[PDB]
């Protein structure tokens, strides 16, 4: 089971993320079911948009909304829905939506998976266009869903992101 | 496990379908294995055809052939093999094949997944070309497999389709 | 050459559209070069969005921005960049950008190409979600290019769309 | 222009084919317009089928239906619509539709393009399932367009295929 | 679980292979996790190459490196990562890498899945180009990974391949 | 026609490149025919490799092999075969094959097309893994075509790349 995946091999610097939606995919919003470990279609998205990075969660974590910690993972090629990426957090995008405070971490693959990100220490080391694409996507992807809305607060750095990982791992027990 | 997925949140009007073959996919006929929950390649299809809608089954049901209830689900984008769609049945295509009586339900996504189908109450509310494509596909997709054949009987409406859902759920126990 | 293609077989009710950007495609804004007839990359789009319908122009027409008349064509499957679709206008989206006023027609394939659009005579006969997606796309796709803005004025019907074809055809003479 | 391309470097044994519809593609029936050289959408195909091989024509030939000679080209990977393949005929599928008699050649890439077809000298040297798929495709792909019918007469060998090339080349003079 | 899949319905002539990497896929090297049954991204491959055949392993086997028996499966269309193919071994490619002796079997689908391979009894019955592509891929796919290397020994036939299947099945207990 | 396209808007710093083979594409080596302007299949590549960047040529240039100047263009998304990209050279890969000496430029999109390459002025400003992939690709892609060989001499900077553009432009006069 996915529950047999640890939150990471090494604390917050070295974590696992289970991908629910590949980057640059069809506008199908998948979510993994806790009981099933199965990929559920939560909705077909209203707007003509795609996730700018792979979107998933850290197994064995618990966030404020009761669900695992949300993470976007940047990769050189989109990964398969349901697959698991060893990665490293570099930032945190603060938002609020219809459901309350909702933050998304952003992460890059571990050095064992690729050398492309060795010099990416903070989200500000990612391309500025990609950061703006992530802000813009979350500001607008729910625009055509009645009863859903998003407000962007701002970004925080890698240390805060790792802080949220530790909090969510302990909240899981 | 897939067996931890109920046949639906609400009886026959609101059901879950596990997708084995996405719409418009490569001509690979996948089937989910009961013991494994794993996707098995049952065959590479002989004819140069594709499923006109996503093809799967309702978990926790039992049909006449001993297997779960077959369902085709219409969606705006093909969904991933192995994913689970909350949907609503609108019709039933009656057929017989080498194995005996074989009916396929047809369904559209629940209102929470998309607004595109709110006015689709009966299979006759779907495009006539799509209905004819479904009849034509099942009449011919086995034409190049020795020892396999299909005869189409005809279509029945949404109430009959929901009737078959209830029958298969009770047969599962 | 593309200039050999008339605006239509029959006036404004039966027109041809040369596609530049397929529906549901990667975020590459191609434009056909008037002289070479070759497909140029105008830009990689800044936002994580995709054209909700195929986008192109009517040959041998002239609009106010000095270019042929813009048209979105709804199709059951996205069509190749550079290919030509016989279609019929059903609506017009009014808007203006920084460059001035700018409208896009919306159209559907001629009945010889597909039976699926027989009952679509006005843009309001298309799914409401699609109309909303087209409007949302043009409102936001340029949000990440500095200085660019688009305000939506609203939709107009098929008669108005055909009027704009008549006008743009004569402007090309 | 496409008219600058000869029927072949060497007669009927070494020909060129301009591809209109790639193998394994979406069900869009493209046809190249004689005048503009542009790829037109002739129709969206009614049935849930795909061309089992790349489909196109030999430039500077003339058949009985007043159009260049039709040829299917088997390739290890589907080739782009509008591209040109140096190939060699190995068979001919005889049939007639409502429009009259109609035959398609089948061909394989010249040995300069791939070594994979060295031992394919007759269509019977291709996998039997492919030959059956081509026959099944042309028997059924038009089943959902009213009034259209196709009856298969049978296959003929490479010598007959080369005879039809010789003939169609002279008809174009 | 994948562990509920037998090594095959019938010994070494009729085996199951769980696919980790589809043929002709993105250069993402997936591996199934023993504890999770989940697909892990082991790395993004350095070189600009793709697996020439589907790559997976036989469930319920144990090889020298402690892992299940590696198998490449040739199919007419790439199969989904995580899916299971009933197949039949036809050869064995001997190699050594940074980790020690590493052999890969090669297999074709069982007759129930496709008729395309009935006459393929030995790996030498596969196209010579495909055999050379497999040798070339494994000789070079690690060229841009520091600390990884591969040396090709040579090929062995179907009987040796089935011999390795039996050895690995018994080693699993 | 493609001949109407100048080598660039501005000399060697601002050039156009006509793409023949998109990045990350199937292993089909297309070449544009000088006369017909049509995309020909030159060969199906023997090795299981793909071009790591889009590959094409500068119009209205002449190299030593009697063909226009070869250029690889790095883009955020692969671009369609036959399309034209406004770009800027940043490096040159020196090598020779059996045919003689042969160099490829590497280039990035003009800032009007994308902001992502502002700080890329020399090829050493691209990810090191990409530079290594390009070198590895050209060293090995022809390994399975008998008699063909390529030896890499090394990379040179942007000034040298622009020198080769100046030279090839005058050779075309
Ligand atoms: Mg989440
Ligand atoms: Mg959340
Ligand atoms: Mg949210
Ligand atoms: Mg079934
Ligand atoms: Mg059944
Ligand atoms: Mg059946
Ligand atoms: Mg325009
Ligand atoms: Mg315009
Ligand atoms: Mg505009
Ligand atoms: Mg034809
Ligand atoms: Mg014809
Ligand atoms: Mg015909
Ligand atoms: Mg392995
Ligand atoms: Mg191994
Ligand atoms: Mg190894
Ligand atoms: Mg070249
Ligand atoms: Mg060259
Ligand atoms: Mg060369």
Coordinates of C-alpha atoms and ligand atoms in Angstrom, one line a residue, chain D residues 55 65 67-68 70 102 104, ligand 11:
Chain D
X55 CA -2.2 6.5 -46.4
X65 CA -11.5 8.3 -60.0
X67 CA -7.2 11.5 -58.5
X68 CA -3.6 10.3 -58.0
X70 CA -3.7 5.6 -53.6
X102 CA -11.1 1.5 -56.3
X104 CA -5.1 0.7 -52.9
Ligands
LIG11 MG1 -8.9 7.2 -54.3

